[PDB]
């Protein structure tokens, strides 16, 4: 019933079942579905009812209703909106949101009239594609193709004004969890903090700090090993001693405070450390005086004692650790949790608990589409209620009546969501600076791998300009959670991260069944607990909230694991961590936790039996899937902080077997260790034979490789679209490329590559391509550029019309040719367009006509592929013209293998000129042998060898990373069976002379990629063109015919050359040359009328002594700006 030496098939069968059930964008899909189905309703209900007043009007929101994404065509006619229609017409793929509203009036006549407003529209929520509320949900591949949608498109993105936006997961420190750190130069020796949020129902977060005051003297009390704990409550000016905070909670005697802080009085060191904190608060000995002390340091001290006491009580009850409680009698629970925080601080100070580290991913949470949209929608709905209240208050002072339909402005929610998803600034538009930017990127459609990487991507909110290297480092906790190789090389190294293939992010759950089970399974609530029985017992935390203690932790953990395995009361998302040394059981149900499935090892055997594999092999027409495997208790989702307490086996048939004993208490096993890699790092053949920087470089490069990025690229009017002529699946593939859909949408061609030094044109990183192969279509590609244009009606008589201008009807005009336009001013497809040709002819009526036509990007030289005419949101004429250009690989284009070996094309030789084997084989690509030794991409060489074996054999080589069954010697022996030298070397003949090359050359089919970076898109030349309006200096950018910047470093270099004249040319003559007339008496510029020759200096009455001075225009601008600041930069020529 076991799987010995059959494990390779079984593990990949279970992985295939996982990716068939889940996919790759399941995190985003589940997060958005939870936001729509649960979070929106909870936000609407949690909003307080609108109370206004004399009649009283009350507004209550009962239930929210979502519909399918529909478009109200101009007039309003409701209509199902397809995603392709949203992309083409620049529509927003969004669904209207209706909430039932009940309005009650109080007329003081003992009868209250309540009116129920069913299905009241409040706004449109943008719908993530292929989600539950998307129109593409449940559609077959035929249905998807019927709507011109790619079946391989994973979805998981929003369409805002045609642009596809993807929400990147935002990292944050886990809330409700006590963290103790030790700052270097701060006033606090150790600082404990707990970011507390009340079940994510309301309020962003309230952070409470419990810190110990350094080591130096505190005036008259500290004479010990480090003491004087203080607390930093929110909405309070400065520090409050912790004993005063405890006394403000109703505990006056020192014994009660200590029982809430120290759980075993037999420990003298902790009591010694806490004694001076008691000594500081010796003056305060009553609850009311402690409340007064806390209130007096508030935001604004109260006028009288009672209002200060009430303010401090409200601050402690609501804003101090709200996750513990916010209602009345929660003072005991807050005291217990604050004492727990102080206990943690003391343990860290005593050296008994290690300080928490911020890079531990168990201490991190990921804000997916769901939580981010909930955060935005909470504020938007609050603003909507605020505006409804303002409207109602304005309309109720008259006392006539009140209307709800006109009071609701759906624009607020619609525009807030659309703006935050469009611009990416997560927050209010007016507060864009306080709003986090970079969220909701534009979805990358360069390659399918690029789209998958963008849909599975995490972000660290810390600043990129920060030079701190620790958050950028690869933490150990990222194993199986985040790809170790895929990281944005550059200013985001280590900060932007990507998900592992098996990685999953928790969508969130209500911890009501867990708490009910804990009560029903004995335990002991904190209110009913005697503090004497808390040292031996184990604290039970649920979502950070300390709910009680349990005296039998082993049995409780076994029961909880059994329940989660059987999926009875505990869903698979829930994480349960037992800290045995610290006697704590932590249970987490909140969203954002990153988890991955792991097989369960009971005793020394896997729970995955041969019967599970047999059932999964027949997965079709059996209704047996990954969920059945999870429901059977074989696999388990484990997050990082639970992964702390797990004992993992890398492979079953190697680590669970009896040998020289290392570990016999294995509790879990890896499904396959190759699942640590993300989407882009899983296309690397033999990545364990490469240097890690090369794996990272290939992970970056794969998103830049060109293939067929999507199957419906014909219907897509995308700017900067690249499609490859003849994409090929790799001859050497990983077992994960099947789940990455790389065979279906590949980006690259298996190229016969010779690692040789032929003519010196492949030196450095460059490559030599076969010109004859390139002629036969090798690595040919098409470039698609879409031009959008829109007619508009802005002025009273000003308007835009698509038409073909005549020679003299338009005021403005270019020397371009308009003869290619049609009667509608649009060029028909099939028309060959060169640079400067007019794409769309548009005229502006001037309050006759003004030319606003659009021209080609310079030197494109393409052919119009498709022209689309539609109506945008405003109903105006909207045109998208796609121009295709075929780009033959030149000697400037960028190519790379799957091993970080990037390079340009040094030169192209035809078939006769290329070196040739005895069989006439000429390499398609020649790369220099010098790229290998320092960069150490042995996986490149092994890939070449395996590809040579597989092409001759007829199979597809397996290059899964850690195989232990695919060695280089085995590949060599296989190659020797096909008449080739086992090491891949082959005798080559010089193409020019026909002579044998003395050294035998390593030749074989290696998969190569054509990158987006092409010389024609990067070649620029400037010679006295456009200039900037303000600086009068050359424009910036290749697209704007701009000039290259001769920066400060270039200036320093020319100073070192002692080239004063060339420096003057670059910084004065080549850029803006200018002349001014300055006075001779003062150094200020003078009025100079050159035609009249009347030079006058206002201020000196100087008309005779005025000099001409040649200065850069930027210097005149600087001097005028200094004069604007009342500085007189008097230029003196004497």
């Amino acid at each position: 019933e076991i799987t010995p030496d059959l494990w390779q098939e079984a593990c990949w069968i279970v992985i295939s079942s996982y990716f068939d059930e889940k996919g790759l964008v399941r995190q985003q899909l589940d997060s958005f579905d939870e936001f729509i189905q649960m979070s929106v309703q909870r936000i609407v209900e949690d909003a307080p009812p609108i109370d206004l007043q004399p009649p009283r009007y009350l507004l209550k929101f009962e239930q929210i209703y979502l519909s399918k994404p529909t478009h109200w065509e101009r007039d309003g006619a409701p209509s199902p909106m397809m995603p392709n229609e949203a992309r083409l017409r620049n529509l927003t793929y969004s669904a209207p949101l209706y909430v039932d509203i009940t309005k009650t009036v109080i007329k003081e006549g003992e009868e209250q009239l309540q009116t129920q407003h069913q299905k009241t529209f409040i706004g449109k929520i943008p719908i993530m594609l292929r989600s539950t509320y998307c129109l593409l949900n449940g559609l077959t591949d035929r249905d998807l193709c019927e709507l011109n949608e790619c079946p391989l498109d994973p979805g998981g993105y929003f369409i805002i004004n045609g642009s596809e936006k993807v929400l990147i997961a935002q990292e944050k420190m886990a809330t409700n969890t006590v963290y103790v750190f030790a700052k270097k130069d701060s006033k606090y020796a150790y600082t404990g903090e707990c970011r507390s949020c009340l079940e994510n129902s309301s309020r962003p977060t309230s952070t409470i700090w419990v810190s110990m005051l350094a080591r130096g003297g505190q005036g008259a009390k500290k004479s010990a090993i480090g003491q004087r704990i203080v607390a930093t409550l929110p909405y309070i000016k400065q520090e409050v001693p912790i004993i005063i905070v405890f006394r403000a909670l109703g505990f006056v005697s020192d014994r009660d405070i200590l029982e809430h802080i120290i759980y075993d009085f037999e420990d003298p060191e902790m009591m010694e450390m806490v004694k001076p904190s008691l000594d500081e608060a010796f003056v305060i000995q009553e609850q009311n005086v402690a409340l007064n002390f806390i209130g007096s340091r508030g935001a604004k001290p109260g006028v009288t004692k009672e209002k200060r006491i009430k303010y401090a009580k409200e601050v402690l009850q609501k804003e101090m650790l709200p996750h513990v409680g916010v209602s009345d009698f929660c003072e005991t629970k807050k005291a217990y949790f604050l004492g727990y925080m102080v206990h943690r601080l003391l343990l860290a100070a005593l050296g008994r608990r290690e300080l928490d580290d911020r890079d531990h991913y168990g201490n991190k949470r990921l804000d997916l589409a769901g939580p981010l949209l909930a955060f935005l929608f909470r504020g938007m709905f609050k603003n909507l209620l605020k505006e409804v209240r303002i409207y109602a208050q304005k309309f109720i002072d008259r006392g006539k009546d009140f209307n709800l339909e006109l009071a609701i402005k759906t624009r607020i929610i619609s525009d807030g969501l659309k703006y935050s998803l469009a611009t990416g600034n997560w927050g209010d538009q007016k507060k864009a600076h306080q709003a986090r930017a970079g969220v909701s990127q534009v979805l990358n459609r360069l390659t399918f791998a690029s789209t998958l990487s963008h849909l599975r991507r995490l972000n660290s909110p810390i600043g990129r300009d920060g030079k701190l290297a620790k958050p950028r480092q690869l933490h150990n906790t990222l194993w199986g959670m985040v790809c170790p190789a895929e990281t944005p090389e550059g200013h985001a190294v280590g900060l932007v991260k990507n998900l592992a293939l098996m990685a999953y992010i928790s969508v969130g759950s209500q911890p009501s069944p867990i708490l009910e089970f804990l009560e029903e399974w004995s335990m002991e609530n904190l209110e009913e607990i005697s503090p004497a029985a808390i040292a031996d017992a184990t604290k039970i935390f649920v979502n950070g909230c300390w709910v009680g203690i349990h005296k039998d932790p082993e049995q409780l953990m076994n029961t909880l694991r059994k329940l989660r395995r059987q999926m009875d009361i505990i869903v698979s998302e829930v994480s349960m961590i037992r800290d045995i040394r610290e006697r704590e059981i932590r249970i987490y149900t909140d969203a954002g936790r990153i988890c991955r499935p792991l097989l369960i090892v009971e005793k020394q055997k896997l729970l995955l039996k041969k019967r599970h594999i047999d059932q999964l092999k027949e997965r079709e027409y059996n209704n047996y899937s990954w969920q059945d495997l999870v429901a059977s208790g074989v696999v388990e989702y484990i997050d990082t902080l639970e992964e702390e307490t797990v004992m993992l086996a890398m492979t079953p048939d190697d680590l669970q077997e009896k040998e020289v004993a290392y570990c016999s208490t294995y509790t879990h096993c890896e499904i396959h260790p190759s699942m640590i890699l993300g989407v882009c790092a899983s296309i690397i053949p033999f990545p364990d034979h490469n240097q890690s920087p090369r794996n990272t470089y290939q992970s970056a490069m794969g998103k830049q490789a060109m293939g067929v990025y999507i199957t419906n690229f014909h219907v897509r009017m995308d700017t900067l679209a690249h499609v490859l002529y003849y994409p090929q699946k790799p001859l050497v593939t990983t077992r994960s490329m099947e789940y990455l859909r790389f065979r279906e949408l590949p980006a690259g061609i298996n190229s016969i590559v010779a690692i040789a030094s032929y003519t010196g044109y492949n030196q450095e990183d460059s490559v030599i391509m076969n010109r004859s192969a390139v002629d036969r279509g090798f690595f040919r590609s098409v470039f698609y550029r879409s031009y959008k244009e829109q007619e508009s009606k802005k002025g009273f008589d000003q308007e835009e019309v698509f038409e073909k201008p005549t020679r003299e009807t338009c005021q403005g005009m270019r020397h371009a040719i308009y003869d290619k336009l049609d009667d509608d001013g649009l060029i028909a497809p099939g028309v060959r367009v060169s640079g400067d040709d007019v794409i769309i002819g548009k005229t502006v009526t001037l309050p006759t006509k003004r030319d606003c036509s659009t021209f080609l990007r310079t030197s494109e030289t393409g052919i119009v592929d498709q022209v689309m005419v539609t109506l945008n949101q405003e109903g105006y004429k909207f045109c998208k013209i796609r121009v295709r250009s075929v780009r033959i690989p030149q000697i400037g284009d960028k190519f790379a293998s799957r091993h970080g070996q990037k390079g340009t094309c040094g030169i192209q030789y035809r078939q006769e000129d290329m070196p040739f084997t005895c069989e006439g084989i000429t390499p398609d690509i020649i790369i220099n042998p010098h790229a290998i030794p320092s960069r150490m991409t042995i996986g490149h060489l092994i890939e070449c060898l395996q590809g040579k074996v597989s092409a001759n054999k007829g199979e597809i080589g397996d290059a899964t990373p850690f195989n232990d069954a695919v060695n280089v010697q085995k590949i060599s022996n296989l190659l020797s069976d096909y008449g080739y030298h086992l090491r891949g070397n082959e005798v080559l003949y010089n193409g020019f002379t026909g002579r044998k090359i003395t050294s035998q050359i390593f030749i074989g089919p290696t998969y190569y990629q054509r990158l987006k970076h092409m010389v024609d898109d990067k070649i620029h030349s400037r010679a006295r063109g456009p200039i900037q309006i303000l600086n009068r200096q050359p424009m910036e950018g290749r697209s704007r015919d701009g000039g290259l910047r001769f920066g400060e470093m270039e200036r320093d270099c020319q100073i070192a050359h002692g080239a004063a004249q060339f420096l003057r040319e670059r910084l004065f003559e080549a850029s803006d040359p200018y002349q001014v007339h300055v006075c001779n008496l003062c150094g200020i510029m003078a009025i100079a009328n050159t035609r009249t020759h009347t030079y006058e200096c206002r201020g000196c009455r100087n008309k005779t002594q005025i000099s001409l001075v040649r200065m850069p225009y930027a210097c005149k601008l600087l001097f005028q700006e200094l004069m604007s600041m009342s500085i007189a930069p008097r230029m003196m020529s004497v």
Partner: protein
């Protein structure tokens, strides 16, 4: 070394000097309670902090599957072959890589260093 609380208001007691009888007293600063000291020692500070860490080790750590275990060191009390060993896992441990052994099997919980 320890801390004694009041028997009237349950507040902390501070040592005080008896001028007449020359006897140490613990007197509450919140009320009039006093009592005679038994230990006669007020403050203890251990700079070397040489404390037997076996007192700070929980017997439940024997249930951790992530800790190594050996049969070479048997328990001193019950003579059980299996024992789980670990290092200090503590800061300010001076210079010590020594191993602390906790006996497996339920209800023994013996902890020793070797």
């Amino acid at each position: 070394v320890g801390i004694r609380f009041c028997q009237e208001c349950n507040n902390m007691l501070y040592p005080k000097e008896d001028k007449e009888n020359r006897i140490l007293l613990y007197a509450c600063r919140n009320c009039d309670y006093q009592q005679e000291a038994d230990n006669s020692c007020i403050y203890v500070n251990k700079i070397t902090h040489e404390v037997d860490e076996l007192t700070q080790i929980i017997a439940d750590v024997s249930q951790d599957p992530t800790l190594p275990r050996t049969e070479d060191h048997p328990c001193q009390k019950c003579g059980h072959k299996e024992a789980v060993f670990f290092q200090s896992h503590s800061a300010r441990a001076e210079d010590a890589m020594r191993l602390y052994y906790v006996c497996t099997a339920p209800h023994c919980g013996h902890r020793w260093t070797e």
